[PDB]
């Protein structure tokens, strides 16, 4: 009624008649009350389902969420990160938000996001204590997505789901940043093919291939396992459902499965993922240090990084091997199997980076 | 329906736009061209009789209905401030008197005088011809510096023109045009027009919070005036240093304005200013 | 005071194009060809209402080959104009395709035409300026235009001068043996006499006619239709002010940074094209100038310089019809972000855009009409080709008899040498426009 | 700021392949030639900014350059209605007339003659592109006209650009049928040396298994290039889907080959597509792929030397079910259908992709293999031995003695053979779990 101003069809007579009949009962029957309530709830929820599924375009809302709140426009986010790395490497200020929004919109125009009237509704936000005047020392450290939801779909979209989207987007953007770092390092090492291989070059290539395998497995799993099943199951739920509450719980369990697959809710695995992200960044920075072959200091820092990488790889294998004799999460099992395409870890002794310099 | 068919408010607002809002282009064009010809020639322009003669001669050609409401009685720091205090009136027949107030008249005069000032600057730039100066190496260098300063000035003034066109007038006028039809209530339509005029006023930089801002631009505008006279005075009234100091002042004002725009936009003060920012950093 | 524009019809091609442009103006306004008009719009700034209360066009119908005058007369549009405006003169069949001969014959009827010119000048309260529409390929046309430019600049040094010159392609050989000579003479006159000249390559017009209309016939009729469309698109701005530019003065002044560098690349959209849809379709602001940027959409064969020291100095986009500020801003942003415009390599350059609205009588293949004025110095190629063609002919010492039979060049061919020097200085200024010092 | 790659169709076979690929892309995107695109095939999420460049009218003219010493191919492609779709300026017409005679040395000499002629074209094309990831070369190393020019182009592109990637769709000669060009081993080998050093990644496209499949699967006994080029265009368009459709990974060319190239000297890659053109779950698709008959390229001819697939990548188009991939991984592991390098990682990565809704789908799932396998090294020896015997005979070298570049010496051929032997040795060492020691 509020959105009509700013639902019962004609069965209101039946509802009033039933309420009167219940009133005329000499002894109250809770079962009859419940059945009347359930019938009316079914009618209302069917009206809501029909008004939401077909003429409120919840499908398009979810599609746009998955495209941007959940990644799916690789060119878009790739170019955005390429542009905004220079600006987000530093702790943000009061102008970083506007600048990054400008870059986002211009890249989207360049990546041919030209038919979206939601483009002016797709905005950015940077969260920073120095932008409120350990605070985020980089623009990549705290970044959210601002999007507008109207009647009636905004009723579904509680802020909690919004920060879920924010945190999952943070995770995916971090993983894509590592992907791009590895890609650029691979291209730099490709350039060396006009030169001759050095021992440091070989060790760099080996570590690069190691972490490339790791992140590629991670991201392939994330795209397929973390996403495809949950999206598909929520799609089938909404297709099958006929009631508001059914759709609500369907999307609820969909996002529950997504967050379970995210493995942020597990402290140890989240910490290890952060560690490996930091190690990848450090390796890319070290490669960036020498435009040509690494120097002696480059070799020493590579050795330190390889030591840390081997330590953390043992840690990650053993936390993947936290329990492989009793019950464990099935998605983690799938992740380890994806890592064990030929059990290279067991072949590698349960760790990566154990090979000599 | 009775007011629309009887008192012709649609025509009233059309004349509002035509005269007070720069839509009767040819007439007022000629009118202020004559005024600027009078000013540059040191001729009598403040003459109230001359003003009324010009106003009536202008309005009667196209709008004899308006050739009566349009009346200029202007009476008289900076060469731009010479245009300050311009007198212009309108005829609002009752019961349309309820719609239009004297405060409305004052705001219309304010916007029209800002339009007149910007058109004065534009006309001063336009009237000069490179051949006008040429007919009138250090002289060549002074001419080149004149040319660079003039190009910069014309880019600034054109950005100002376009901003006035669409930021304040085209969009606001189009919205009011649509929203007046959708208001069946006298009070509702009065509120609509009040908000439309308030929006135009704000987009015209007339609020105190940005006075200094406009105080910067009009100075640059004033720099045009003796520029144009210096354009027509040959190069004996200008040297290297005169032109270069004019250009240094222009560039200082430009950088100050760019900084002010960036600060205000980052503060979120107003989202239509970024237009003016991009216009300033366009060149 | 209100502006007025008077069109000097001269040369066979120029007379044809002027007649077709006037006819198109009358038709778009629903004007009878007898001076009878039948139903903010302006239909009096380029016509004029005589004592007969008919909108006779503000035009001068002159030719040293009055065959086109007869063709106009036999058409029902002779009633549209005054017979006084149509002043035919035949000295034996025209100048014979000689610049000197046409200049002399122009001096021969100096007053017989200057009286008419001053008559119509005094009949107008204010003048937008003068326009000379012709093709400089005909030595008759070139000489008459040079004489007219000289006499007008002497008589009227305060009125705007524009020249719609149909430039034949200087890359090939024209049938005129003295074609480079006439071209150089007219170019010197335009640099000196003419304050602003729009460039219209004949060969470029031919190729555009063959492409857009997919015709294999180099029909002068299609060329005239194209140019008439361009010129009518020009006057549409002077019909509807919209928010600015009730005069051509502001339009031209944006495009001239130097009273000798005043030559313009002209592009129009939509162009008459049988290879594309001519019905009204919705395009964004970014669509319009993007489509114009294609050289196929530009009516001159000269390119753009982004690998030598020549850059777009002025890029004026005239948009007529519905406008959105976001569209304009995004168009500017995307053009600059796409490096679709060049700064002068001695200072920052700017893009000029005209936010205007269309009159409802103009036929519409789009809801937005787009005009492009490109003061981009990549057009000196045709001038350099003509300069080399003159140099090669002077080295061959050929076709100097056409001017040696005229006493003007009988004294010497130093007139041609000075024309060559002036054109060389113009090419030098083209090249040096990428520097802080124009010279 | 998109990742743009310019197509360089070269030679008799490469020009045909590029034209077929452009036609396939137009069909995928509903593009009518002359640059006109139908409106109802543009409402999707496909990308038209990789091999097509958005013109000043949003009509995706291809980023195509036509290069050949054969004016007949140029004229034939011009006669196609798609010629209006293509940019005429990008097309280069062979002005030599006689060309190279399908000679590597003559092709290289002609290309070095026309260095600036095409370097200007490539520079003007790149300047109009934003974030050019690299250059792709659809070319035939058999026809020496193509091969010598392509070798020169590779050298010049490597010298000119430090970051623009080089991708080669190398159409290998048919060792099933000997032609009259005996210097084909001589020509290719030289190309190989450039391919060794001037090419980042090499796409093996062997006509031997192409003809062997066209004979039976298509039941056509002709070795005609028409059906071979049809299938090649089909497979390469399938290869380009992740580039032309929205996704999460593999949206970039650098990530296309990052997971397939662990060693910068190990870059020769084979491919396969299923279902085959004959005239479901992931398990069936992978079982078809691993079946040797379904591989488009002739593989290693010596299974006694246990060749190991260094890299195994699998793109899928159409219906997607994660359970299918989950079970296919276990089926791989249980059946041991894939060889793994023990010194490095050789795991299984599978990408999910979408088919075009603007074209008639023939399969719910179409799966294509991207494999780095050491068996191809044998084919190299298959070439090298064919070279060695030709070098042994000391005959027809006079054709390369027609040009002074090889008249003076054949040290270039010796270096090419040396490098090819080195590559074969590296391949064989990769089989043993000691290649990290190298």
Distance of CA B212 to the CA centre of its chain: 18
The span from the CA of B120 to the CA of C119, in Å, is: 32
Sheet holding D165-172, edge to edge: D64-67, D4-10, D132-140, D165-172, D201-206, D268-274, D365-373, D309-318, D348-353
**CB neighbours of residue A318 within 10 Å:** 12
Q: Is A110 on the interface with C (CB under 8 A)?
A: yes
Q: Is B261 on the interface with A (CB under 8 A)?
A: no
The span from the CA of A52 to the CA of D371, in Å, is: 47
Q: Is C259 on the interface with B (CB under 8 A)?
A: yes
Inspect the structure and tell me whether chains B and C have 3 or more CB pairs less than 8 Å apart: yes
* Chain A residues touching residue D351 (CB < 8 angstroms): 220
Chain A residue closest to C327 (CA)? A114
Per DSSP, the three-state class of D25 is: helix
Q: Is D57 on the interface with C (CB under 8 A)?
A: yes
Whole-number CA gyration radius for chain A? 26
Residue contact A98–B266, C-beta within 8 A? yes
* Chain C residues touching residue D119 (CB < 8 angstroms): none
The span from the CA of A323 to the CA of A321, in Å, is: 5
Resolution (A): 4.5
CB neighbour list of residue D49: distance below 8 Å, 6 or more residues apart: A75, A111, A112, D2, D4, D60
Distance of CA C372 to the CA centre of its chain: 13
On the question of a cis peptide bond just before residue C417, with omega within 30 degrees of 0, the verdict is no
Strands D60-62, D52-54: pairing kind: antiparallel
Distance of CA A266 to the CA centre of its chain: 15
Bridge partners, residue A50, by sequence = none
Q: In Å, how far is B147's CA from the nearest CA of chain C?
A: 7
Residues D198, D201, D203, CA angle at the centre, nearest 5°? Answer: 115
Residue C372 structure tokens: 């492009």
Whole-number CA gyration radius for chain D? 21
Residue contact A94–B265, C-beta within 8 A? no
Residue A94 structure tokens: 């009061």
Q: Is C249 on the interface with B (CB under 8 A)?
A: yes
Question: In A, residues 311-350, which contact D (CB 8 Å cutoff)?
Answer: 334, 337-342, 344, 347
Residue contact C258–B147, C-beta within 8 A? yes
Q: In Å, how far is A246's CA from the nearest CA of chain D?
A: 24
**Packing angle of the helix pair C139-155, C12-28 (nearest 10 deg):** 70
Q: Is D120 on the interface with C (CB under 8 A)?
A: no
Question: In A, residues 60-99, which contact D (CB 8 Å cutoff)?
Answer: 67, 71-75, 78-79, 82-83
Residue C137 structure tokens: 């390929």
Chain C residue closest to B17 (CA)? C243
The span from the CA of A350 to the CA of A315, in Å, is: 9
Instruction: Give the residue from B266, B268, B269, B273 with the most A CB atoms within 10 Å of its CB, the best one to mutate.
Output: B266
Per DSSP, the three-state class of D370 is: strand
Q: Is A102 on the interface with B (CB under 8 A)?
A: no
Q: Is B271 on the interface with A (CB under 8 A)?
A: no
Q: In Å, how far is C329's CA from the nearest CA of chain B?
A: 8
Instruction: Give the residue from A103, A104, A109 with the most C CB atoms within 10 Å of its CB, the best one to mutate.
Output: A109
The span from the CA of D84 to the CA of D77, in Å, is: 10
* Chain A residues touching residue D325 (CB < 8 angstroms): 224
CB neighbour list of residue A102: distance below 8 Å, 6 or more residues apart: none
What backbone phi and psi angles, to 5 degrees, belong to A306? -70, -40
Per DSSP, the three-state class of A185 is: helix
* Chain A residues touching residue C334 (CB < 8 angstroms): 109
What backbone phi and psi angles, to 5 degrees, belong to B97? -55, -35
* Chain D residues touching residue A217 (CB < 8 angstroms): 347, 349
Chain B residue closest to A99 (CA)? B266
Sheet holding C196-201, edge to edge: C86-88, C59-63, C5-9, C129-134, C161-167, C196-201, C263-269, C368-376, C312-321, C350-356
Query: Solving technique for this entry?
Result: cryo-EM
Distance, first Cα to last Cα, chain C: 37
Residue contact B282–C332, C-beta within 8 A? yes
Distance of CA B149 to the CA centre of its chain: 21
Q: SS3 letters for chain C? A: CCCCEEEEECCHHHHHHHHHHHHHHHHHCCECCCCCECCCCCCCCCEEECCCCCEEECEEEEECCCHHHHHHHHCHHHCCCCCCCEEECCCCCCCCCCHHHHHHHHHHCHHHHHHHHHHHHHHCCCCCEEEEEECCCCHHHHHHHHHHHHHHHHHCCCCCEEEEEEECCCCCCCCCCCHHHHHHHHHHHHHHCCCEEEEEEHHHHHHHHHHHCCCCCCCHHHHHHHHHHHHHHHHHHHHCCCCCCCCHHHHHHHHCCECCECEEEEEEECCCCCCCCCCCECCCHHHHHHHHHCHHHECCCCCCCCCCCCCEEEEEEEEEECCCHHHHHHHHHHHHHCCCCCCCECECCEEEEEEECCCCCCCCCECEEEEEEEEEHHHHHHHHHHHHHHHHHHHHCCCCHHHHCCHHHHCCCHHHHHHHHHHHHHHHHHHHCCCCCCC
Per DSSP, the three-state class of A169 is: helix
Instruction: Give the residue from A92, A93, A95, A102 with the most B CB atoms within 10 Å of its CB, the best one to mutate.
Output: A95
> Which of the other chains make 3 or more beta carbon contacts under 8 angstroms with chain C?
A, B, D
CB neighbour list of residue D264: distance below 8 Å, 6 or more residues apart: A189, A190, A192, A193, A205, D200
Which among A73, A194, A206 has the least Cβ separation from residue D436? A206
Distance, first Cα to last Cα, chain A: 71
Inter-chain Cβ pairs, chain A and chain D, closer than 8 A: 134
CB neighbour list of residue D95: distance below 8 Å, 6 or more residues apart: D114
Residue contact A186–D265, C-beta within 8 A? no
> Which of the other chains make 3 or more beta carbon contacts under 8 angstroms with chain A?
B, C, D
Inspect the structure and tell me whether chains B and D have 3 or more CB pairs less than 8 Å apart: no
Spatial contact of D92 and D18, defined as CB atoms under 8 Å apart: no
Residue contact A75–D344, C-beta within 8 A? no
Instruction: Give the residue from C326, C329, C333 with the most A CB atoms within 10 Å of its CB, the best one to mutate.
Output: C333
């Amino acid at each position: 009624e509020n959105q009509n101003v700013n639902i019962l069809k004609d069965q209101e007579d039946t509802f009033a008649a039933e309420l009167h009949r219940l009133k005329q009962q000499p002894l109250f029957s809770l079962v009859d009350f419940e059945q009347v309530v359930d019938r009316i709830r079914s009618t209302v929820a069917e009206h809501l389902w029909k008004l939401m599924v077909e003429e409120s375009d919840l499908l398009g809302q979810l599609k746009i969420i998955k495209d941007f709140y959940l990644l799916g426009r690789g060119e878009l986010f790739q170019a955005f990160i390429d542009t905004a790395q220079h600006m987000l490497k530093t702790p943000p200020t009061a102008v970083t938000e506007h600048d990054v929004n400008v870059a986002f919109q211009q890249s989207a125009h360049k990546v041919l996001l030209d038919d979206d009237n939601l483009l002016p509704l797709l905005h950015l936000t940077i969260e920073y204590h120095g932008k409120e005047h350990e605070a985020p020392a980089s623009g990549w450290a705290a970044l959210g997505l601002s999007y507008k939801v109207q009647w009636p779909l905004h009723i579904l979209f509680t802020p909690a789901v919004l920060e879920k989207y924010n945190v999952v987007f943070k995770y995916l953007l971090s993983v894509r940043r590592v992907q791009a770092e590895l890609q650029h390092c691979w291209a730099l090492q490709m350039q060396r093919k006009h030169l001759k291989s050095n021992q440091t070059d070989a060790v760099k290539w080996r570590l690069r291939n190691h972490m490339a395998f790791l992140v590629d497995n991670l991201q392939y799993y994330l795209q397929v396992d973390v996403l495809e099943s949950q999206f598909s199951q929520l799609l089938h739920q909404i297709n099958s459902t006929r009631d508001f509450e059914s759709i609500r719980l369907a999307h609820d369990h969909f996002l529950s499965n997504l967050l379970a697959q995210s493995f942020i809710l597990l402290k140890p695995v989240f910490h290890c993922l952060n560690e490996i992200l930091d190690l990848c960044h450090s390796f890319c920075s070290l490669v960036s240090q020498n435009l040509g072959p690494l120097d002696e200091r480059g070799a020493a820092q590579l050795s330190i990084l390889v030591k840390g990488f081997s330590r953390q790889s043992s840690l990650l294998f053993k936390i993947l091997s936290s329990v492989r004799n009793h019950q464990i999460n099935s998605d983690l099992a799938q992740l380890l199997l994806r890592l064990d395409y030929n059990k290279y870890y067991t072949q590698a002794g349960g760790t990566l980076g154990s090979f000599g310099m | 329906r009775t007011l629309k068919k009887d008192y012709r408010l649609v025509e009233y607002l059309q004349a509002m736009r035509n005269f007070f809002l720069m839509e009767g282009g040819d007439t007022m064009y000629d009118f202020y061209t004559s005024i600027f010809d009078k000013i540059r020639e040191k001729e009598t322009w403040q003459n109230v009789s001359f003003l009324n003669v010009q106003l009536q001669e202008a309005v009667g050609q196209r709008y004899p209905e308006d050739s009566s409401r349009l009346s200029i009685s202007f009476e008289n720091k900076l060469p731009v401030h010479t245009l300050d205090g311009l007198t212009l009136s309108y005829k609002v027949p009752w019961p349309v008197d309820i719609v239009i107030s004297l405060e409305c008249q004052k705001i219309y005069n304010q916007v029209f005088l800002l339009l007149l000032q910007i058109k004065w600057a534009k006309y001063s730039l336009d009237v000069l011809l490179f051949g006008e100066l040429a007919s009138s190496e250090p002289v060549r260098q002074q001419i080149h510096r004149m040319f660079l300063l003039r190009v910069k000035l014309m880019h600034f003034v054109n950005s100002l023109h376009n901003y006035i066109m669409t930021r304040i007038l085209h969009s606001t006028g189009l919205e009011f045009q649509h929203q007046v039809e959708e208001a069946k209530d006298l009070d509702q339509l009065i509120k609509i027009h009040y908000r439309y005029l308030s929006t135009i006023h704000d987009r015209c930089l007339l609020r105190e919070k940005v006075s200094f801002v406009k105080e910067a631009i009009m100075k640059v505008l004033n720099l045009a005036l003796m520029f144009a006279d210096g354009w027509q005075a040959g190069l004996g009234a200008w040297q290297m240093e005169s032109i270069e100091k004019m250009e240094s002042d222009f560039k200082n004002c430009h950088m100050f304005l760019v900084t002010i725009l960036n600060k205000a936009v980052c503060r979120g003060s107003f989202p239509h200013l970024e237009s003016l920012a991009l216009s300033l950093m366009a060149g | 005071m209100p502006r007025e524009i008077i069109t000097l019809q001269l040369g066979q091609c120029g007379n044809q194009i002027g007649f077709e442009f006037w006819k198109q103006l009358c038709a778009e306004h629903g004007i009878s060809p007898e001076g009878i008009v039948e139903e903010t719009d302006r239909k009096d700034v380029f016509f004029y209402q005589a004592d007969d209360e008919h909108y006779i066009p503000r035009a001068v119908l002159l030719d040293l080959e009055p065959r086109v005058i007869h063709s106009i007369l036999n058409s029902p549009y002779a009633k549209l104009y005054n017979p006084e405006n149509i002043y035919l003169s035949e000295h034996g069949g025209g100048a014979g395709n000689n610049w000197a001969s046409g200049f002399s014959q122009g001096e021969k009827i100096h007053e017989d035409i200057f009286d008419i010119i001053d008559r119509e000048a005094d009949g107008s309260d204010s003048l937008e300026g003068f326009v000379l529409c012709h093709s400089i390929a005909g030595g008759t046309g070139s000489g008459l235009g040079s004489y007219l430019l000289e006499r007008l600049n002497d008589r009227y040094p305060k009125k705007l001068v524009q020249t719609y010159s149909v430039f034949p392609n200087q890359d090939e050989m024209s049938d005129v043996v003295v074609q480079p000579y006439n071209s150089l003479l007219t170019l010197k006159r335009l640099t000196q006499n003419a304050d602003c000249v729009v460039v219209l390559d004949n060969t470029a017009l031919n190729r555009i006619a063959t492409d857009r209309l997919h015709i294999q016939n180099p029909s002068f009729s299609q060329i005239n239709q194209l140019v008439s469309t361009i010129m009518s698109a020009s006057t549409t701005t002077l019909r509807y002010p919209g928010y600015m530019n009730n005069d051509l003065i502001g339009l031209i002044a944006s495009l001239i940074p130097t009273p000798r560098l005043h030559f313009l690349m002209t592009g129009y959209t939509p162009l008459t094209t049988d290879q594309s849809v001519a019905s009204v379709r919705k395009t964004t602001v970014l669509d319009v100038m993007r489509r114009l940027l294609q050289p196929k959409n530009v009516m001159v064969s000269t390119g753009r310089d982004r690998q030598t020291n020549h850059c777009y100095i002025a890029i004026l986009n005239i948009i007529q019809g519905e406008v959105d500020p976001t569209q304009v801003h995004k168009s500017l942003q995307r053009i600059r972000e796409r490096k679709l415009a060049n700064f002068i390599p001695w200072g920052p350059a700017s893009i000029q855009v005209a936010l205007s609205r269309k009159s409802p009588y103009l036929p519409s293949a789009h809801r937005v009409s787009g005009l492009m004025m490109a003061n981009h110095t990549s057009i000196s190629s045709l001038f350099e080709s003509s300069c080399q063609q003159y140099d090669k002919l002077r080295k061959r010492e050929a076709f100097l008899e056409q001017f040696r039979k005229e006493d003007i060049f009988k004294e010497n061919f130093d007139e041609l040498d000075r024309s060559r020097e002036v054109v060389q200085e113009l090419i030098d200024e083209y090249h040096a426009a990428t520097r802080p010092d124009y010279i």
